[PDB]
């Protein structure tokens, strides 16, 4: 985070140790269930690059997954520095040097230039691009982590309809997909995948029955 | 929240996560009872849209319940719009923008127009018509999730006036009805379902009981 | 259709009768398969709207067919009503008269003046325009007649990869959802459907594979 | 097509409906088996550009074949481009100017641009490029939607020799590989792939065989 002093000048604050002991806990006990990412964000909020890096790095077990997020990172780098060449030339005072692929990640950026760079008027937020890049990871990692495809869950033959609905749409937050194709598969594959017992009653009520109606109504099978 | 800054221009503040953790942990343990409500109003004090998603998003089980939030909030998210139509014309300096349905729920919006809104005299609340919403969606989800209905709260052969009672005004308190059934419920069927003892005294105590009369009436045995 | 007489002077040319014949055909034999909408196109070449009748009483027999046909064609009339206001005023006696929503659909229209509306420099089509309107019903009544949903074709355990592949096509042309739901159907859907042994090379080979590889790497399978 | 008037003048005339119906016809129900090429390239007869996208429009129903197509004759446009670079300077004004790539393929012509082009002395043909450009395309999209590979065509243990003949043909045909690749295969694959009995036959018959003595020797067997 970063906050002004007394003259006014903005300074860095360190994350609380309370933060960083909720979030380490959060990554230890969860697995890596699809509310990381909601809970990462939250965690994160207007945080420098160095304080993201100490969020990441802090987790200590996990190691393969913190790997394939190291590996996502360094890949956004280099194509956000294939796409900005760099500008030879000195820096004018009014001004500061254009931060690289690798500058933005905190891997050779100090903590002054990483607080001048998103404070500057205009603002160039290294923070909320480097959180970008965090979160497209973890999205690639928690889509993993996941057990099965949205188009393999079925309900059981004797399994409540609320708990198939639970599986359901924990399984499509953790999905991959744009937003067309996941009110596609909302509208579709939750009737076409229930059981025997419930699939005539939801075909029955209708095409645009809402959720609270076809709970209610396969209530007691 | 909205704080404001030293110079005195309002400024977003994040969640504390330890908030953030207990409301998390309200709906890990306490399920959907009644009593989620009033915690869901008090830890949600003066939020901005941002905040009321983040709150809804960070809760990990019982994503169908989530989902049926959703849904409540999209029909008053359409309601909204068709009630108030899109005005056309340029945006004076002195006004922004008019929000419309999917506007309010802060899914196609930045933070800092709701911060303008939520401070700019007159005030347009959008933070507390979408907590409206949302406790609207939440009534339903908990008058679905009561686990049995009026009707079968009985009184045991040994079990003592107050457990019952107890158990009794908490089913009928999860499964909203109107006053006049409450009433109703409450002066007889609270009678009827009594044990033979407790039942008796009951009945020749009078009509017009109030509770706490036939509790103290009904404490010997 | 239109022709150019000895005189030079546009003139109309009835629908020869084993065109309106094999129109016939097409409706009652093809049984409102997915190819009844390019063999309409194809008979329908440039016709005025009274051959575009003409042609249409064919699906009179059916009543249901012609029912959503009739439905669709009024509604698109009148969203043309809608959308061009009759302008009341004086006109250019050079220039003819406005082609109100029952006058492109030539309910109320006389052939000359469909001749001189579709012969004008520059032309106004209304050929083309009922041709799209009864393409929009035939779409309809095609997704109606569909045998089968796109989740329930499902290749064999011995059919050739390019026979399940054809059949998926057919399927998905007939139900038309939208485009982007279209490209993930085909991505994903195709390889999740298959037989074991096509669905192990088609895993194998990777994601986001062009159709070409797929079926060259699949053939004798 | 082309056409001469009473004025003795080239006036373009359209393709008839049935024609445009037939290759619908072949279109949507010969598969892509490699008899579309001789039936297309019949319709086709003498066609203007213009009348060849009428054609072409049909394929536009299947994504990939339209595709391969389009990607086929943008490639070969490309190629036109680079070998006939445009003349910068004047002409004479009996001339017409010169087709570019997108100009030969009528996606930027008008109709009297491509009937004058037809109709010259000496002429210079459009049609007939463009109709090459589309075989060639025709000709990979029937080599990707084959069957089987030209390997595993094998004579049943009954099948007559002139069955098996055709099917082998067949497959050839749709496989084109180069020219001598070709008498390799009709020379040596035939005889190997044979069913004891004809391969008994044809190879006591000796080697560098024409067709007609091998088809004539094992006839009833
Ligand atoms: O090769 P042809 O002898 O000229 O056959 C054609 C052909 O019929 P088939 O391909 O079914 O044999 C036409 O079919 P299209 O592909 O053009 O559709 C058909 O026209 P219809 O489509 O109208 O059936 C026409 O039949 P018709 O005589 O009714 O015009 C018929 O010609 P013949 O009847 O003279 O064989």
Same mark, same amino acid.
């Given at each position: 985070?970063?906050?002004?002093?007394?003259?006014?000048?903005?300074?860095?604050?360190?994350?609380?140790?309370?933060?960083? !002991?909720?979030? =380490?806990? *959060?990554? /230890? /006990?969860?697995?890596?269930?699809?509310?990381?990412?909601?809970?990462?964000?939250?965690?994160?909020?207007?945080? %420098?690059?160095? @304080?993201?890096?100490?969020?990441? !790095?802090? *987790?200590?077990?996990?190691?393969?997954?913190?790997?394939?997020?190291?590996? %996502?990172?360094?890949?956004?780098?280099?194509?956000?520095? #294939?796409?900005?060449? =760099?500008?030879?030339?000195?820096?004018?005072?009014?001004?500061?040097?254009?931060?690289?692929?690798?500058?933005?990640?905190?891997?050779?950026?100090?903590?002054?230039?990483?607080?001048?760079?998103? %404070?500057?008027?205009?603002?160039?937020?290294?923070?909320?691009?480097?959180? #970008?890049?965090?979160?497209?990871?973890? !999205?690639?990692?928690?889509?993993?982590?996941?057990? %099965?495809?949205?188009? @393999?869950?079925?309900?059981?033959?004797?399994?409540?309809?609320?708990?198939?609905? @639970?599986?359901?749409?924990?399984?499509? #937050?953790?999905?991959?997909?744009?937003?067309?194709?996941?009110?596609?598969?909302?509208?579709?594959?939750? *009737?076409?995948?229930?059981?025997?017992?419930?699939?005539?009653?939801?075909?029955?009520?209708?095409?645009?029955?809402?959720? /609270?109606?076809?709970?209610?109504?396969?209530?007691? *099978?």
């Amino acid at each position: 985070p970063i906050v002004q002093n007394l003259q006014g000048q903005m300074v860095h604050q360190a994350i609380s140790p309370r933060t960083l !002991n909720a979030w =380490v806990k *959060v990554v /230890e /006990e969860k697995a890596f269930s699809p509310e990381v990412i909601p809970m990462f964000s939250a965690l994160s909020e207007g945080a %420098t690059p160095q @304080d993201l890096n100490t969020m990441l !790095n802090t *987790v200590g077990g996990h190691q393969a997954a913190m790997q394939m997020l190291k590996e %996502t990172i360094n890949e956004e780098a280099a194509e956000w520095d #294939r796409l900005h060449p =760099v500008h030879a030339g000195p820096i004018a005072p009014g001004q500061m040097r254009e931060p690289r692929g690798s500058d933005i990640a905190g891997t050779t950026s100090t903590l002054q230039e990483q607080i001048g760079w998103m %404070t500057h008027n205009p603002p160039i937020p290294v923070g909320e691009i480097y959180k #970008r890049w965090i979160i497209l990871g973890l !999205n690639k990692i928690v889509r993993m982590y996941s057990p %099965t495809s949205i188009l @393999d869950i079925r309900q059981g033959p004797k399994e409540p309809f609320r708990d198939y609905v @639970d599986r359901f749409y924990k399984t499509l #937050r953790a999905e991959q997909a744009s937003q067309e194709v996941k009110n596609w598969m909302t509208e579709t594959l939750l *009737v076409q995948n229930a059981n025997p017992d419930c699939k005539t009653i939801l075909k029955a009520l209708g095409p645009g029955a809402t959720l /609270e109606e076809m709970m209610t109504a396969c209530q007691g *099978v």
